[PDB]
Amino acid sequence: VRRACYGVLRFIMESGAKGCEVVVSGKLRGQRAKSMKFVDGLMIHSGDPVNYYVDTA
Amino acid sequence: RDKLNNLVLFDKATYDKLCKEVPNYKLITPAVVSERLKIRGSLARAALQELLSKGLIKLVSKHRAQVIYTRNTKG
Amino acid sequence: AIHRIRITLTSRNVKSLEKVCADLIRGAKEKNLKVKGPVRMPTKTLRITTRKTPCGEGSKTWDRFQMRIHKRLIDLHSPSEIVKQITSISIEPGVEVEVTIADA
């Protein structure tokens, strides 16, 4: 999960973007679930401009 | 101060009191006469407009809730 | 022929709606057709208020989704025939058109 997220994050930044954030949540490593987040570049979170400045999946 | 037991209908001892001393002071209303002569208050509204027809009492307001009368002018 | 057509455009976004209204009436001026002005009907706003939580536990928060629908009426009334003169729609996705004769 750590290596795959780095490859996807680098692929997005290489194709041209202001920033990118990927969050993977679930039963990683041990039994108890964890959420690993990898963020780089610029990333707004509030207001109207988030509707047309980011793509969320 | 338990119950008013006011006068639904007149008697002679109070009717004359209505006829002689009620149209003598400045502010006469059905509430004032009801508490003063211990009459009911429905009898007060009827008797006040009876004195209006007799002409010895002048009306000023004529409202559904607050109808106000007065004594005649002296002087 | 003698023709008279009522044209209505119903969409959701004002951006494309003002664009489709402007260029359709702009071509008619080059075609010297008599055109009534854009009749901006009152907006139909679809309002739905649904609880935000999918379970029913929390601080009683609600979500209010508003859908805006805008309608314009444009009359193409030339003294002569009209249908063969304007057979081009030149429309974009997001706006719905409807052609109505004067009889209908």
């Binding site: - | 400045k26 502010l27 209303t29 509430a31 004032v32 009801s34 508490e35 208050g41 000023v60 307001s61 409202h63 809730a65 607050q66 106000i68 007065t70 | -």
Partner: protein, 189 residues
């Protein structure tokens, strides 16, 4: 001149103390035909002074739940009551109002957070603006309480409340609580 309620010219009334001359609005600038105006009197501090006091009494006379928006009824009760006090005193109803307002507003009170003997701890004299506000509220509560379960109506009960307040006979609920507040303040000096 403005003929409030159609009569009762406001140019003959006067305030007999300068501490309240500038906070009562019976003057010609605030002389109004009717005590009814939505002039946004709660937008800013120190704006209820320029609000006419006849309107202020009308505002404070609607309370106790059943009467929280009804201003047409309150204006008609004030209209009845002012005519009644004119019929019972023979002077301007506004002069009766100014006499009642001054004679009802308590001039001292007490308020603390620490240990209190009877009600409060330390005596503090009140402001002229609080004098008027407490005066109107005390008059409205006195009229309402007397009229709650008796055959006398609101216009009459408000009339005798302001009349007994204008003279001063320890029968007005406004002056009764005023004397109680002054005595408590004197003890808490």
């Amino acid at each position: 001149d403005i003929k409030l309620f159609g009569k009762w010219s406001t140019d003959d009334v006067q305030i007999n103390d300068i501490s309240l001359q500038d906070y009562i609005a019976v003057k010609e600038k605030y002389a109004k035909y009717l005590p009814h105006s939505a002039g946004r009197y709660a937008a800013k501090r120190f704006r209820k002074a320029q609000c006419p006091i006849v309107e202020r009494l009308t505002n404070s006379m609607m309370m106790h739940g059943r009467n929280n928006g009804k201003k047409l009824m309150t204006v008609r009760i004030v209209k009845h009551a002012f005519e009644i006090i004119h019929l019972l005193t023979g002077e301007n109803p506004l002069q009766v109002l100014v006499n009642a307002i001054i004679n009802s507003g308590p001039r001292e009170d007490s308020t603390r957070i620490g240990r209190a003997g009877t009600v409060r701890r330390q005596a503090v004299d009140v402001s002229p603006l609080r004098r008027v506000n407490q005066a109107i509220w005390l008059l409205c509560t006195g009229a309402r309480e007397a009229a709650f379960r008796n055959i006398k109506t609101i216009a009459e009960c408000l009339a005798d409340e302001l009349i007994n307040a204008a003279k001063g006979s320890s029968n007005s609920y406004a002056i009764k609580k005023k004397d109680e507040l002054e005595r408590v303040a004197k003890s808490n000096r």
